[PDB]
Amino acid sequence: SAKNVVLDHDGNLDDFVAMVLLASNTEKVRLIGALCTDADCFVENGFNVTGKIMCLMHNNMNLPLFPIGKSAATAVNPFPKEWRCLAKNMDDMPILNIPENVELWDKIKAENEKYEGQQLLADLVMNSEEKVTICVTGPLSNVAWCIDKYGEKFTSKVEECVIMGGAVDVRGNVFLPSTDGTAEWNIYWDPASAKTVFGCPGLRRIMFSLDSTNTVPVRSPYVQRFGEQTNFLLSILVGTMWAMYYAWDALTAAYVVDQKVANVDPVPIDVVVDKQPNEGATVRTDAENYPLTFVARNPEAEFFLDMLLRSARAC
Amino acid sequence: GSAKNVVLDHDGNLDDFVAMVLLASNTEKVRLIGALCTDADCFVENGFNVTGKIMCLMHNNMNLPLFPIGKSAATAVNPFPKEWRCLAKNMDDMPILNIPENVELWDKIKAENEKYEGQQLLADLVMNSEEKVTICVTGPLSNVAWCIDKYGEKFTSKVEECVIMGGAVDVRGNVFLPSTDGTAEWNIYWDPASAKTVFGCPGLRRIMFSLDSTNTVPVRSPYVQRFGEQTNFLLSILVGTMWAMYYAWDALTAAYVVDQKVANVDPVPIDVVVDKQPNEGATVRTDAENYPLTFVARNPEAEFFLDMLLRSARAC
Numbered sequence: 001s002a003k004n005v006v007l008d009h010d011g012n013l014d015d016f017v018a019m020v021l022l023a024s025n026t027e028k029v030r031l032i033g034a035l036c037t038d039a040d041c042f043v044e045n046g047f048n049v050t051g052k053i054m055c056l057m058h059n060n061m062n063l064p065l066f067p068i069g070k071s072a073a074t075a076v077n078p079f080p081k082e083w084r085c086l087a088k089n090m091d092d093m094p095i096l097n098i099p100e101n102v103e104l105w106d107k108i109k110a111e112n113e114k115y116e117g118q119q120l121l122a123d124l125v126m127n128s129e130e131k132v133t134i135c136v137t138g139p140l141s142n143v144a145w146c147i148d149k150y151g152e153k154f155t156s157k158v159e160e161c162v163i164m165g166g167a168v169d170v171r172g173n174v175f176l177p178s179t180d181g182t183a184e185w186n187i188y189w190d191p192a193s194a195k196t197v198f199g200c201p202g203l204r205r206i207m208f209s210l211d212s213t214n215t216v217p218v219r220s221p222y223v224q225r226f227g228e229q230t231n232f233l234l235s236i237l238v239g240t241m242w243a244m245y246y247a248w249d250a251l252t253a254a255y256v257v258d259q260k261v262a263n264v265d266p267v268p269i270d271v272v273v274d275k276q277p278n279e280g281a282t283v284r285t286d287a288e289n290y291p292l293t294f295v296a297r298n299p300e301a302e303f304f305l306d307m308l309l310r311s312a313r314a315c
Numbered sequence: 316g317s318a319k320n321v322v323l324d325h326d327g328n329l330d331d332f333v334a335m336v337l338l339a340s341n342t343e344k345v346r347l348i349g350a351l352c353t354d355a356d357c358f359v360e361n362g363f364n365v366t367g368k369i370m371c372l373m374h375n376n377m378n379l380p381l382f383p384i385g386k387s388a389a390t391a392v393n394p395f396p397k398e399w400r401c402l403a404k405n406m407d408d409m410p411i412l413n414i415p416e417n418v419e420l421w422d423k424i425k426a427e428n429e430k431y432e433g434q435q436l437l438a439d440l441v442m443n444s445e446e447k448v449t450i451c452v453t454g455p456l457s458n459v460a461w462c463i464d465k466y467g468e469k470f471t472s473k474v475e476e477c478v479i480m481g482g483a484v485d486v487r488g489n490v491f492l493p494s495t496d497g498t499a500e501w502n503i504y505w506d507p508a509s510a511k512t513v514f515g516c517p518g519l520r521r522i523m524f525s526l527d528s529t530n531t532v533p534v535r536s537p538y539v540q541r542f543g544e545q546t547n548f549l550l551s552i553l554v555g556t557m558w559a560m561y562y563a564w565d566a567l568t569a570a571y572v573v574d575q576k577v578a579n580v581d582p583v584p585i586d587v588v589v590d591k592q593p594n595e596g597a598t599v600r601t602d603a604e605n606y607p608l609t610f611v612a613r614n615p616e617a618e619f620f621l622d623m624l625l626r627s628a629r630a631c
């Protein structure tokens with residue numbers, strides 16, 4: 001029996017590949033909602049692309065429709081302008097603008113525009129009958145808001161949080177004049193929210209930090225293999241997105257589909273929030289009784305790559 | 316009517332490929348006899364590959380004869396922004412251009428094409444054609460200049476006309492760098508000396524699509540989204556994907572080659588600034604006695620062009 005999942009993303013190409021993985025694997029995942037954050041994307045574009053992908057899938061593989069909410073979360077440290085656009089251009093991609101699918105999105109657009117992402121995440125998790133897995137592929141601002149505002153009443157309903165973020169025993173990817181390169185972008189965007197999430201007791205966390213995502217880079221030959229599947233809408237979609245980096249978010253969602261993707265190691269993780277060169281770094285803390293986070297280790301690359309090619313044949 | 320011979324001289328960016336689709340899809344009007352790719356607004360290797368992948372996709376899905384494709388040895392005077400040149404690399408990996416049967420065909424004819432020298436190929440195609448040849452230039456003018464320098468009148472006498480995307484005459488240019496004044500356009504700026512040779516060549520008919528005309532036909536989301544109405548056509552998936560990720564510069568230029576109804580033209584004597592000054596690469600009017608005229612496009616038929624492109628993208 002599939003398990004409930006909510007995708008908490010920030011609308012970049014990798015977030016959409018993660019969405020396709022979650023959505024296409026209906027035997028393992030029941031996608032009950034998604035929210036988009038104005039981090040590594042312009043939220044209005046991320047919102048529309050999420051909607052267009054969902055409708056395309058609903059009309060071609062019977063994927064049940066779900067609510068989509070734009071989060072009000074604001075950045076502590078903004079992503080570079082040169083990223084963010086991507087979702088914008090994807091909104092104009094032909095495969096996401098087939099009339100039957102756009103017509104459906106335009107019909108349900110208005111009601112989805114009434115949702116605010118943070119509240120939607122809280123509600124989906126707290127009103128679900130069974131527990132909910134949250135796949136976070138953007139900053140941790142929304143899960144943090146839910147923890148801060150609902151506490152145990154929210155966390156008790158979470159199966160686990162599978163998070164793309166951080167860098168534990170490897171360097172990060174935030175290279176600015178004022179940083180030391182040890183922090184990763186999703187955490188650096190909002191360190192305090194990340195700290196709240198990683199230090200929260202009673203919350204199970206699976207963390208795909210750069211330690212693991214670095215081992216599965218996006219290479220041209222593999223991407224070109226989607227050309228073997230152009231009769232499938234999702235292969236045209238995924239291939240196009242990766243043809244435009246590592247499989248950061250996709251690996252995270254792959255684990256939600258099947259934990260065989262990677263084994264984990266328990267690590268107590270704190271986040272640096274002071275304005276230091278390593279602001280945003282996820283570090284091992286020595287604090288007594290500090291909650292553990294299960295950090296992904298040695299991901300199964302071949303298994304993941306095959307999973308994505310297969311998932312892209314759902315329709 | 317009979318189709319006319321055309322050679323596409325391009326530099327591998329997104330609009331160069333839309334231009335390619337327009338030319339290749341209109342077989343009743345255009346006989347595309349060859350193409351060359353320059354290392355300007357693309358890394359030539361990638362531009363060459365994408366040109367081949369598109370040609371093979373079309374040949375395996377419609378009546379369109381294969382043609383030679385060559386890599387130009389032209390070198391930049393002023394290179395394009397690194398960020399813009401990588402698009403051919405991205406296109407090289409797009410799924411619609413990597414269907415096995417099409418990649419297989421490209422792999423089979425690759426050896427013959429990778430041995431051509433682009434500049435000599437342009438000269439040979441033009442000069443050895445029975446009828447005159449129209450050159451559609453959507454990248455810098457380095458290759459036409461090379462041909463004029465090497466063969467002079469033996470080359471120009473065989474050119475029906477050169478339809479060029481480039482320049483800015485009475486409007487601002489688009490080269491905005493700390494060292495420039497903004498009056499130059501990129502294709503000319505990439506190699507000003509070659510452009511000067513071309514625009515000052517006596518005995519060469521030139522049609523110029525400068526920013527003065529291209530600025531009037533911007534690429535807009537609603538229109539680009541219309542390619543979503545035609546996803547059963549490979550070229551619509553292709554064109555829509557490229558315009559989705561600005562004006563139809565190169566595409567307008569190629570559309571005119573398909574049908575001159577796209578625009579009327581004004582005779583203007585065009586010279587080019589070659590000196591290393593803030594306006595390097597600017598295309599300027601010259602009052603020099605006996606200077607040759609260039610026919611500068613005006614008031615392009617936007618709707619006609621937009622419809623032509625949508626229809627052409629249904630060729631396959």
Ligand SMILES: [Ca+2]
Nearest residue numbers: 010015137138
């Ligand atoms: Ca992301």
Ligand SMILES: [Ca+2]
Nearest residue numbers: 326331453454
């Ligand atoms: Ca060009």
